Design a protein around this ligand. Sequence first.
Ligand SMILES: [Ca+2]
Ligand SMILES: [Ca+2]
Ligand SMILES: [Ca+2]
Length: 228
Amino acid sequence: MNDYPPVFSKRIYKGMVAPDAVKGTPITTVYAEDADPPGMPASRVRYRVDDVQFPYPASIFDVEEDSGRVVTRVNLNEEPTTIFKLVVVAFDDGEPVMSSSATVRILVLHPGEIPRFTQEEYRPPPVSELAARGTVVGVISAAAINQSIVYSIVAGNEEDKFGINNVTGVIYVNSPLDYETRTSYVLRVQADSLEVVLANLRVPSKSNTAKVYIEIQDENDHPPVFLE
Ligand SMILES: [Ca+2]
Ligand SMILES: [Ca+2]
Ligand SMILES: [Ca+2]
């Protein structure tokens, strides 16, 4: 019998593509498996696009039948920041032939317009534990072609001990620091292009994320002695 359909690994895939991408530019691979006995038609999954609800994405993208790679059907000329919903259907060679669908949300964006930091690690001089709010700690720097850069701290600042000026990329002291509580931090930072920020999006990659090693400088204050 053939009584199990293909089941996509994910319900919604993501993927990027340049706005001027040539024909057959690879975007992403989708994937689905079939629970019927292996080696047979019933569990032999082919991939196809669909144009019921989203015919235009289907007009410019296509999925390969056997590999599952999503690619450009045409040399494209679409506008940046756009998001398309391409609908992919995986179907078996069974009897009766079963299937299931899934969505590939594709982002139209240039790779070269994603920012690049000046360093992957920033090691600024050690900040006094008694430093006041607003005391500058260090500064981070990132370029991108035809792009102004918004900076953000994305991880490692769980204590809200730091803030960053989201435009100058200047990291500063937000809460008061205690050396005895914690002697060092490592922030994950992220430069995103302004055009991207405006479309309510973030696009991380190796070159638009960097680390900041902050070192706390001990002064004579009241040491915490015991806790609980
Ligand atoms: Ca099947
Ligand atoms: Ca202290
Ligand atoms: Ca101290």
